[PDB]
Design an enzyme around this catalytic site. Structure first.
Site, PDB file in Angstrom:
ATOM      1  N   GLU A  11      43.983  36.442  37.800  1.00  0.00           N
ATOM      2  CA  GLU A  11      44.899  37.326  38.412  1.00  0.00           C
ATOM      3  C   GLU A  11      45.046  38.498  37.594  1.00  0.00           C
ATOM      4  OE1 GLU A  11      45.031  38.025  41.282  1.00  0.00           O
ATOM      5  OE2 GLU A  11      43.728  36.733  42.374  1.00  0.00           O
ATOM      6  N   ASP A  20      45.122  46.770  43.096  1.00  0.00           N
ATOM      7  CA  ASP A  20      44.238  45.828  42.837  1.00  0.00           C
ATOM      8  C   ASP A  20      42.828  46.300  43.100  1.00  0.00           C
ATOM      9  OD1 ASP A  20      43.211  45.510  45.674  1.00  0.00           O
ATOM     10  OD2 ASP A  20      44.334  43.523  46.159  1.00  0.00           O
ATOM     11  N   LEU A  32      50.282  40.314  46.001  1.00  0.00           N
ATOM     12  CA  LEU A  32      50.232  41.876  47.010  1.00  0.00           C
ATOM     13  C   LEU A  32      50.970  41.656  47.552  1.00  0.00           C
ATOM     14  CD1 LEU A  32      48.121  43.120  48.688  1.00  0.00           C
ATOM     15  CD2 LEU A  32      48.643  41.823  50.773  1.00  0.00           C
ATOM     16  N   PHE A 104      45.113  31.033  47.641  1.00  0.00           N
ATOM     17  CA  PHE A 104      45.685  31.972  47.076  1.00  0.00           C
ATOM     18  C   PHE A 104      45.369  33.726  46.936  1.00  0.00           C
ATOM     19  CE2 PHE A 104      48.603  33.001  43.973  1.00  0.00           C
ATOM     20  CZ  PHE A 104      48.657  34.058  43.364  1.00  0.00           C
ATOM     21  N   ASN A 132      25.444  29.174  49.134  1.00  0.00           N
ATOM     22  CA  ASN A 132      26.121  29.412  50.141  1.00  0.00           C
ATOM     23  C   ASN A 132      27.114  30.545  50.007  1.00  0.00           C
ATOM     24  OD1 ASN A 132      28.611  29.342  53.042  1.00  0.00           O
ATOM     25  ND2 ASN A 132      26.143  29.413  53.275  1.00  0.00           N
TER      26      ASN A 132
END
Length: 164
Positions: A11, A20, A32, A104, A132
């Site tokens: 991050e 972001d 956020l 998270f 997947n």
């Protein structure tokens, strides 16, 4: 390597309101603030989150406090969630960090939606689950971070972060 160092790699650390990859108002270590278009709304959420008038700016210490809170909420969330809890319980320590990472970033609700991959993880079908997971908006939008998480699930090692 631990969950905190891993998410700090993914991050980053920003002491000023930034946007972001998705366009939203974020601060610190992937915290956020709002999905609202208003920088003014963002600054108000920030003050509310910090308990002080920050005016878009925080100290490193404040970023860490937020980060501690976020990681904890992610862990308690998985453990209170009927879909996630059983997958988490079935995993080894490294892969546990990977699910934490996804939660998270994307919330419990979002990860809970990867039905098929969760099923393959619970079944220890490493290669199939990695294939997947990559079939997602998530992977298409942020392929480098997504690839690191995916490799962590695939191998159960810290290899993808070891350089970083």
């Amino acid at each position: 390597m631990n969950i905190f160092e891993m998410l700090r790699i993914d991050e980053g650390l920003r002491l000023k309101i930034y946007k972001d990859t998705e366009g939203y108002y974020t601060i610190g270590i992937g915290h956020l603030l709002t999905k609202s278009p208003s920088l003014n709304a963002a600054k108000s959420e920030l003050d509310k989150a910090i308990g002080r008038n920050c005016n878009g700016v925080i100290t490193k210490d404040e970023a860490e406090k937020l980060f501690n809170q976020d990681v904890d909420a992610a862990v308690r969330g998985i453990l209170r969630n009927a879909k996630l809890k059983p997958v988490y319980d079935s995993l080894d320590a490294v892969r546990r960090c990977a699910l934490i990472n996804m939660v998270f970033e994307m919330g419990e609700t979002g990860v809970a939606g990867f039905t098929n991959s969760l099923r393959m993880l619970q079944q220890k079908r490493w290669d199939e689950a990695a294939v997947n997971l990559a079939k997602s908006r998530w992977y298409n939008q942020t392929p480098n971070r997504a690839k690191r998480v995916i490799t962590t699930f695939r191998t159960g090692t810290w290899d993808a972060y070891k350089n970083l």
